[PDB]
Structure formats: structure tokens, C-alpha cells
Amino acid sequence: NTASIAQARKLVEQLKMEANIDRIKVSKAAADLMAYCEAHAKEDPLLTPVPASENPFR
Amino acid sequence: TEDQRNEEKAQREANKMIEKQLQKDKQVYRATHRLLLLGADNSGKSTIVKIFETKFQVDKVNFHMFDVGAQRDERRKWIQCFNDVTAIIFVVDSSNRLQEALNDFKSIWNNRWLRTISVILFLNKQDLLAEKVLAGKSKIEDYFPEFARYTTPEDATPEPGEDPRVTRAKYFIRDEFLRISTASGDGRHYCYPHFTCSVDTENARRIFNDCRDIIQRMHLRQYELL
Amino acid sequence: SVRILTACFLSLLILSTLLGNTLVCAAVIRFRHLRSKVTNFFVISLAVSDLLVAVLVMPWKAVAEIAGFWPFGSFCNIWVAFDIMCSTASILNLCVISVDRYWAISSPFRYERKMTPKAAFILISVAWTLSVLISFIPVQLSWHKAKPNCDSSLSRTYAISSSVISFYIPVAIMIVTYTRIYRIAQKQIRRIAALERAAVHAKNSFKRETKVLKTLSVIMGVFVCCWLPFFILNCILPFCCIDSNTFDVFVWFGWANSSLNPIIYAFNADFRKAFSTLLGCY
Amino acid sequence: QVQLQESGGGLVQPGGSLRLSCAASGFTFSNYKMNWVRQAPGKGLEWVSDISQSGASISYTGSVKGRFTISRDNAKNTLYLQMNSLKPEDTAVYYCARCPAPFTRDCFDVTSTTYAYRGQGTQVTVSS
Amino acid sequence: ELDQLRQEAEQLKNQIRDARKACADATLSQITNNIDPVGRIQMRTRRTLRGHLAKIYAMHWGTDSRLLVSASQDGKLIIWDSYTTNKVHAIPLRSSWVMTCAYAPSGNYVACGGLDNICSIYNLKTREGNVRVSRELAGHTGYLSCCRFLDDNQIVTSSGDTTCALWDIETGQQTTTFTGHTGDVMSLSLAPDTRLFVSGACDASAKLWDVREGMCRQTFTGHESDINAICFFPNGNAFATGSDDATCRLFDLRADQELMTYSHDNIICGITSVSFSKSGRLLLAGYDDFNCNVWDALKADRAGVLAGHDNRVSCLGVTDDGMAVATGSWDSFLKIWN
Ligand SMILES: CC(C)CCC[C@@H](C)[C@H]1CC[C@H]2[C@@H]3CC=C4C[C@@H](O)CC[C@]4(C)[C@H]3CC[C@]12C
Ligand SMILES: CC(C)CCC[C@@H](C)[C@H]1CC[C@H]2[C@@H]3CC=C4C[C@@H](O)CC[C@]4(C)[C@H]3CC[C@]12C
Ligand SMILES: CC(C)CCC[C@@H](C)[C@H]1CC[C@H]2[C@@H]3CC=C4C[C@@H](O)CC[C@]4(C)[C@H]3CC[C@]12C
Ligand SMILES: CCCN(CCc1cccs1)[C@H]1CCc2c(O)cccc2C1
């Protein structure tokens, strides 16, 4: 019995520990991913296709 | 470009040496029949042939048999490593753990990645099954109610001097795995039942005979003769 | 309308032969996995012999059969060597395929061990060497022509001996190999039936057995139906009984195998997939 | 978050009857074959019964054929086990378990000691 | 008391769910409305790499975007020049049943392991000029499922024993163990600012672990079946995951929740592998349906497809400069795409 009680205690302790954090308001978080893509879309060879003079797999 | 030509020559020599090694290792790999060995803790899988590994050869054919020993009871991810073995050897202690063996067999049989692999089914401890129906309170009827309505196949072969109750119990337990395997085999994979007990040497022949049948049935399917 | 109709059939049959034999080559050069299996070396080798029946043989007789005379002149003996060669190469490749299939089914472990690319290139080069040997040498030494336009009449010893080597030996081989394959398929059918019937009996096969007959009866029945009527009369004519306009029907029956061989030997689900992709079919 | 809660349980008389209930959340319940497994006191987990995605195919252990009936509601996201003629031998915790991946007939790990896709289970005790 | 602790865990989970609902402004699909779609991505196989005798079961790319590693269940671990197609090394292994491999960020070492429940490390830059086992990291009690180097001394491992571990390779011992997963841990991804990592684990959960502190900051639970695959988005603030439930899903760290799900009812296959492109704008995923879907990470459109394999796409990865995708599969071939 008492081992299963300690497993439930460890779940409660972890849940209590991750409940307490600040959560950054989702519109800002989605806007930051969107901003990161816009800032790097010029670099990205898979998003922005590449000529055979630059593509090493050409 | 001689700086590049020197490195190209170095990579070309490396590649051609590696390809020579991989060709010799392709022969060792293709020559070897990989097998996966399965069963409950009560199943005598450790004594069928005379990870843990067991290499044996029959008629100059190499069988390499793997038992996944020291791992957790949930298997749905590690079992996917065996999608390319030539057979699964599945070992059952005849006794109630028979329903655990049937549910394990069903899950091995119906898995997306094991659909192409035939099962060699060793129904082990038949001496214990025999004495425990020659004596004791017919409890197979209580674990499996269909053992009232069942009767022996007329193509069933008894061993010399076995009692008809032993034959009835043997072929009943055998036919349950045949019910599970026949329900979805699709001609893609087959079940090869054998009766056995822990003193048998002939099991090593039986695995070779069934691997002939697996590869024959595979070639017959390939040429649309099955 | 007989000449109009005959031109339509022979033109279509050449295109059917060209297309089918080229699809088999095209699928192997496009897709790597169809080239990986050593069984398919013999299928490629068959399809090339059949493609040569389509390019080196059928067109020039078809034009001569439309025109009613041979227009190509001194090409005649070269065309006879092409005809014997591509006919023999097709028949010997059908025989070598039956030996490959019988070795795989009869001795599956020894087959995995011994059917290396070396062994397949030996059997392929033996088939094609025996087709070159039986054709060009008896033609350039003029042993092939009758004992006294491209009339194509053959000496009795060359006709019999070349029919034995190019047809009656490979027919005895294909009959034995597909008879032994039938007996193996009957044993495996019966053992599958015993276990499925035991499952049904505890729950309380002739369709699968008919697939054996249907597949072997297509394989041998089409081969024999195309080539046997030619190779029986090819023994009779120098030993003489038959009108030339009728004998030419059996010549076209023999060559029609190069058209049918892709459907018999290059139609596993992987080849059907490769054709379907390459040709945009589905 | 994938979870299952079992309901129905406690003490009942031998020869009696009792309906178990399970409510799912965090999954599209219709895509999963679903199961009951039981643990008797001091003994291993054993399989009781299965129901497929559609409810058309069902199965039971040989101890249970006729005596229990499994059923499901793909619109309510619930699984049930109506139990009849209970023996003392049926005394166990009963767990609602789910097959691991959607769209398949294999269910390897539903009887495993630890497994992610079962509920907490409910006690069923069969005695006077 | 077990019912009281289980009930307090239900109270805490309901409280965490309400804390996430308080943060949940709008779905990312609405935020990105003004952004132009990617349109039809065309990527074509620029190489096929061949030589494995059995199913390729794993990959990693070098930091040079030029060498890559793959493993197969014949017991081979091959290192390739991706520009030239040349095999640079072809390491034999003690146990054939490999399930992961990795390549140190220096290129000095390669790791692998599988059903042996060991992680074996190979030095590529030995004084004797030959590849050999530098160490075996034994101690996991179920199959090694993923591993990844921080540097030439430190490796994170993931296991069927439902744990991750951090090892120091010179020491040969677990510098930490990460224990909170309930299913078999399937895959890892390390943060770009390498102080954190994520795992997903044969339960609906992914966890974010602190490398220095040794226990998870957050547990993400929005999946529906076994998470097979996981990857950071290139800024380290979000990650993708793919599972047997046929969805990919994007999660924030900072908002503690899902942002998006990627699916069609046309897809009934488990996802084996996931990776972003360099901008994060594409999310690539490999599937049991034998192909890869390319997703716009900001929209959930299928911006394209990679479809070159005869059997399961087992692994996928994008080079450190984003210049190519590699994909491996159970037919024994790698394809490289650009
Ligand atoms: C005798 C001459 C004039 C005509 C016949 C040439 C024959 C022998 C040639 C033509 C095409 C050739 C095949 C083309 C493609 C392949 C696939 C490759 O993976 C192995 C060799 C193999 C199987 C070749 C074997 C030899 C072959 C069959
Ligand atoms: C072992 C394999 C390669 C043998 C193949 C059979 C070959 C060699 C046989 C079959 C047909 C034969 C020919 C048949 C007819 C004649 C005409 C005769 O007046 C002289 C011999 C000659 C020219 C034969 C030479 C040998 C021959 C070409
Ligand atoms: C141009 C090609 C494709 C034509 C092929 C004709 C085929 C389909 C014909 C020729 C001979 C036929 C077979 C002749 C005899 C039997 C035995 C009988 O008990 C079942 C049907 C079966 C097995 C037939 C099936 C169809 C068959 C194989
Ligand atoms: C389909 C038949 C093709 N040809 C027939 C050539 C013609 C004869 C009359 C008009 S056109 C045979 C000729 C004889 C022969 C042979 O002895 C041995 C091996 C092949 C062949 C091929």
C-alpha cells in the first residue's frame, strides 16, 4: 500500500511545483513565433528556394 | 582543384573499401535466419532449442534466435524492431495462463508491423497436460466452456499410447491458436503448431521445417500460386 | 478486305509487343526495387528478347506480308538469323524463368544461398549464347537452308536439331518444373486447408487450389498454344504437307508470345504499381 | 488530457448483478478499441473483455462468456460492463482500459502493470 | 489517504487547466490571418544514400550541414558525406537492434543504442585513425529510445524504462536522472540556448526538463496517444510533437499550452518524426503512410509533400543551415531533399 501513497504524493508535489509559474498571454506568444518567422524567412533555404549556384546539392 | 582531387581520392578509396566490407556483411546477413522468441514466464522458451541470443544451424542453414529478456512488460514500441524476422517462435505452457497466452498471441498476430511474419507455435509441457487430465477435476471445462461442445479433429494424430482425453485436451488448446490465426491471416502469414515437452531434441528440426514452409509459401504467394 | 485486315492486326501486334516489352524495361531502369530482385534479371532478359522480336523480326516480315513480296533484298539471311535468335532467346528465357521459379519453390534455402547475380548472369548468358550460336553460325555457314525472295525453307537436320535445342528440350524442362511446382503447391494448399478447417471445426480451400491450376494453366497453356503449333510443323515441312499461307498463321502465333510475356511474367503488384506511376494510370 | 473514470462498484451478494460505467475525456473515443481488465486481491491483472470502435465486434474471457456484457456510446464518450450472476471469484478492482493507438485491432499493453491509457479502476466485492 | 492525494491531484490539474484557460486569448490560426501563405513547396530528392542491409531506424546531421549519421537493424551505423554520397565510416555494432543515433556538435563523436539498453559512444578522431567504442553507458533498464549530445563530454538519453538521464561520458555514470514520465520515453530535443530539453513518452505527455536543476518545469498533455517525435522551434520558446494519434501539435513553453494542431481525416497513420525548417515557418513530419507532409507552422496548410519511400519514414532531420531535409525509412534508403 504505502509505496502507491508516495507515488500519488510525488504527482501532487510536481503538479504544485508546475502550477505556480507565470503564463505569458497567448496573443503575445503567437505574435513572437510569427515575428521570428518573418525575421528569418530570408535565410531559410527550404521556405525560400535556392539557385544551383548556392545550393550545394544542385 | 588538386586540393579537392586529393580529398576526392581519399573519400573514393574509403567508400570502395566500405562497399567491399558491406558486400561480405550482406552475405552474412542474408545467410542468417533471424527469429524472435516469445512466451510467458511459465513457458519453457529457454529449453525449446537445446536481448539474449541463440545461434544454431540445421542442414547448413544458420538460425539466429533472439529473446528480448531484460525489458518492461509493455512491449508495443520495442516489438517493432522485429517487423523483418523470418518467424516468431511463440511458446505456451499447457495448463489459468492459457487466456494470457491467447491474448498475447492475438496482439502479436494482429499488429500493423507483424502482419507479414509467420508464427511457429510450440505448445510446450504436454507431459504435464497429459498427467493433469489423466488425473484432476477436468478444470479445462471451467476455464473454457466450449470444451463441452468441442471434439477431436479426425485428422488429429495421437502419439502411441496417449489416452483420448489427452488427445481431446491437446488438440483443443492447439485449435484455439488456430482460431486466432485463421481469422485474419490473409495468406500473408501462417501459424505452425507443434506439440512438445522439455525433453524433445526434434524442435530444432521443426523450426527448420517451418522456415522452409514460410519461405516456400512466400515464393508461392510471390508467383500467385497462393 | 483480307490484306487491309491483316495489315491492321500485324501493325497493332507489333505496337502491343513494343509497348509491353518497353514498359518492363522502362520500369526496371526507373525504379530501383524492381531491379534489386535477382528473379527480375530473367524478366528483363525475357522482355529484351521479346523487344528484339518486336524491332529486329516482326516489322520486316509484316511489311513483306502486307506487300506480298520481300523488299529488303540481301537483308534476308541477317533477318533469318535475327528470327532464330530472338525466337530462341524468348523460349530459352521462358525456360530459365521456370528453372529459377522451381529452384526458389523446391529448395528455398539453397536458392537464397546460390542465386547470386553471378549464377543469374551465367544462366542469362547461357540462354543468349545458345540463341546466338544456334542462329548466326548455321546461317553464315549456310547449314540452315534446304537440301538442293526470302523463302525461308530449312534443311531436315537443322530444322529437327534446332527445334530440339530451341523448343522440345525447354518444353520438357518447363513441363517438369511446373509439374513439380504444382505438386509442391498442392502439398502447401492441403496443409493450409487442414489448419483452416481445424479452426472452423473448433469454431463449431478449393478457391486457392483453383488459383494454382489457373496460374500454371495460363503460364504453360499460353506458351504451348503459341509455340507448339509452329514447332510441330517446323519438324513436318522438311520431312514431307501444309499450305504456306496457313503455316504463316502459326509463325505469327509463335511470335505473339513477345506481346503476352509482360502480362504473364512482369505483372506482380510491384510491376503494376511501377507501370501505374510511370504511365499516370491511377 | 487522456483519462478514464470508472463508476459503479462496492459490495454485492453472490448470484447478484451490477453495471460498471466508464467516462472518457481527452480523446475521440470512437477511434479506439476499448477494454475491461481486472485485478483480484494479491494476484495479477487479467483481461475481461473487448469492444471494437463500431461496437460490432466484441470479445470476453472464458470465465465471463454470457455472464458479463460490454457496450459503448460513441456520442456520450462512455464504456459499460453490465454484469450478471456474479461469483465470489469475480472479486477484483475493474479497470476501463483503451487500446494505445487509434484505428487498429492489436492492444498489447492493456494488461501491463503500469499503462498510460486506463482509469483508476473501481472495487467490486462479491460476498454476503 | 491515496484517494485524498488523488483528489488533490485532480484539484491541482483543474487549477492548472483554469490557469491555461486564463491565458488562452485566441488560436494561433486567427493571429496569423494577415501572413501570406507559403504556397506549394516543391522539394525534390537531391541524393539517395544506399548501403544499409536492413531498415534504417535513425538519423542525425552534423553542425557542418555536410556529414550525417544513420543506423539500421542489421547492426550498422554509417556516416555519409551528403554532398558527395561517399560513406566516410561504416561502424559495426555489438547489438544489431539499434533504435537511435546522434552526432556530437563538434563532429568528434557519434552515439547509438537500442534493445541492448546501453548507449555506446564511438570516437571518430582517434590517434590510431580507427573507429571504436569510447564508452558504453550501461544503466537504463529498458531500450534506449533517443540520445543527444550537449558537447563532447555530456549526453542526454531517453529510455523504455520511462526515464531520461544526463551522463558525463568520461565518468560513465548518470549525472542526473529524469523520472516523471509514465510511459516509455520515445524522443528528445535539446534547446538551442542549451539549458533545457523536451521529451515525449508513450503517454499523452511531453515534459520540459531543466538540465541544471534536474526536474521538469512543465508537463504538456494535449496529445491523444503515444508521442513518438519531438522538436524545438528554432528560438527555443516552442516545440512540435507527433504521435500515434496522427496529429502533429505545436506547444509554447511561455504560455504553457498548445498553439495549433496539424491533421487531415485523410491521415490515419502514426507520426514517426518531426522537424522545423530554419525560420520555423515549415514544420516537416514523417508518417507510417510511407511519406512526409510539409506543414506551414503558422497556418496548418500542407505546404507540400516528400514522397520517395517504399516503406515507413522512420526518421527525418533538417541541416543546421536549413539547406536540406534528410529522411530515412524501413526500405533502407536515405533521401536528401531541397
Ligand atoms: C546477345 C546480345 C546481342 C543481346 C542480349 C543482351 C542481354 C544479355 C542483356 C540486355 C539487357 C541486360 C540486362 C539489363 C539490366 C540488368 C539489371 C542489372 O541489375 C543486372 C544486369 C541486367 C539483368 C542485364 C543482364 C544482361 C542483359 C539481359
Ligand atoms: C552444349 C550446347 C552449347 C550445344 C548447342 C547445340 C548446337 C551446337 C547444335 C544444335 C544444332 C546443330 C547443327 C544442326 C545441323 C547441322 C547440319 C549438319 O550437316 C552439320 C552439323 C550442323 C551444322 C549442327 C552443328 C551443331 C548445332 C549448331
Ligand atoms: C490471353 C490469355 C491471358 C488467355 C488465358 C486463358 C485462361 C484464363 C484459361 C485457359 C485454360 C483455363 C483453365 C482450364 C481448366 C481449369 C480447371 C477447372 O477445374 C477450373 C478452371 C480452370 C483452372 C481454367 C481457368 C481459365 C484458364 C486458365
Ligand atoms: C515464329 C517462328 C519464327 N521462325 C519462322 C520463320 C519463317 C518460316 C516461314 C515463314 S517466316 C522460326 C524458324 C525456324 C526456327 C527453328 O528451327 C528453331 C528456332 C527458332 C526458329 C524460328
Coordinates of N, CA and C in Angstrom, one line a residue, chain E residues 26 131 280 319:
Chain E
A26 N -6.6 33.6 -28.1 CA -7.1 33.2 -29.4 C -6.2 32.1 -30.0
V131 N 37.8 3.8 -35.9 CA 36.6 3.9 -35.1 C 36.5 2.7 -34.1
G280 N 11.6 28.4 -38.7 CA 10.5 27.8 -38.0 C 9.2 27.7 -38.9
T319 N 19.2 20.2 -41.8 CA 20.6 20.7 -41.6 C 20.6 22.0 -40.7

